């Protein structure tokens, strides 16, 4: 843990992309308009530039059911990947999603149905995590509240972890989230960036590419809910890719077929002429890492390891 | 404007408050329970501090249809008030209020009614703010998209204020909101802070210190959407107040009033033994600013008017 101050070159924020929409259900007061022009998928970024930064900045792209607060202080209080990343020189991009945290959701269709301007098939499809389902998606413990002996979780934080978890808007949004575009927009922009995801976000950055290459410099997948699969590894061929698993994976009938899945995905990358490695935790000697590997206790020996790829493929 | 780079002696993140909700409607999907438990009415907040902090921190609160990156980079890309107060030597804490930006809502109640379960008078209050509405309210100019000849908003960047414009869940929850008794938490923890407010939140600070007044050094208001009542001053006048309002005020029947309204709030503080001034913009000679004064093109010299009374009253 690298104590003492830290030096910003620059600092701020930002959004990338949206789209206008047209609304007469804004409102369901008579004192204000219910008609009129709102923007909306737009993705927050805040930025941070250390002293000599390298030169490919770290963009962080949360899963679901979260914020970029994922990146920040860990639930137990300790220095998370943004600002460990910070102080090991790298630019890093942290964003929310489209449709979650600061970026703008459309709340039309809920008004229009509460109006009866619409049936409430027009509902959008919303989901929230609760903390017992969380638990086992976590791999924290066989099922809620019990922990692993050997858990690199901050068990005893759980009830700070549960306060950054929020409802998830992306079941009413397209395939691929307008997250994806605005990570294209955002990549070209900087001019090369490595693009860093987790779970639900785990497949946006081989979308992103697939869509346009420009400006993607390394993908790191942590975790995803879903690799490419083997036939589509053409477009992926010149970006190096690194997917990270942690550790109980086999006990868990969600966890297992993602892991085989993935090795599928980088056996058949690198088959293709392509440069792929699937990072096993516990295959490194690295015990105990849960699905939120940025928080646990061991967070920073992660985050060299990964960084320590990032830096020998981006040379 | 304060060139070169930032040195922080530290930062983070963490969230205040919260309540536990067991719900039966977290999830539309058979693959996922719907049934769980979680957390709602938690208060994200950001802080970061500078070498040789002040003794004072400043608590910043955003109003409605927007988020704490109000105060961070302004839409045209300038230094925002979190950046300077920062480089003034003062700790930030931004916030996002409870239930909105990365401060989880409860999207129980729109689940229960797309399963047919509940009615779709039961879907939340919500609201969300159009361009051109918003346009009035801020005072850019009399009727969108027209602005006044001597605005200080960077009304150029008008896409990029639209862009951090988000929806507002305030009619669906208790009132006092609860961000009011997080920023009691809150500054009981912090043993002092400044609390500076904004529009929609302009009567939080006022609303906490009523409701306990430790920790809470002083209470700076941005254009209210309310003021105390004259005739409820008695718990206030241990705490050194500022109501900062900006220009082109008369002219919207909106904001007449309530320019009006905290006159009397301040007279009748001072005359029941407080200490408090209203602070108007173009009666100090300076000219032009919007309701989004902390954005403006001379946020820096409205930040420092406000700095030097928070000096002036904090010592
Ligand atoms: C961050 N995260 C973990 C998670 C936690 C709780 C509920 C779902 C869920 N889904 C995953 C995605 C998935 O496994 O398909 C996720 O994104
Ligand atoms: C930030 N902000 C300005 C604003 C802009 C657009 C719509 C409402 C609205 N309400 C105000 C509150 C009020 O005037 O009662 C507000 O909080």
Redesign the pocket.
Known sequence: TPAGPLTLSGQGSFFVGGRDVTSETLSLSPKYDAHGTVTVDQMYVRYQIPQRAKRYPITLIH????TGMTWETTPDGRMGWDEYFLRKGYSTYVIDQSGRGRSATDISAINAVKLGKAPASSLPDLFA?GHE??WA??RFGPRYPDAFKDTQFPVQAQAELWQQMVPDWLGSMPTPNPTVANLSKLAIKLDGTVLLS????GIYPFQTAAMNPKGITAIVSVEP?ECPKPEDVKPLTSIPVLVVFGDHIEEFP?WAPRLKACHAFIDALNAAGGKGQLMSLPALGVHGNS?MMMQDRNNLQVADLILDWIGRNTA
């Open positions: 899963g679901c059911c979260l995590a389902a969380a998606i976590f987790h779970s639900q976000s809910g969600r699905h």
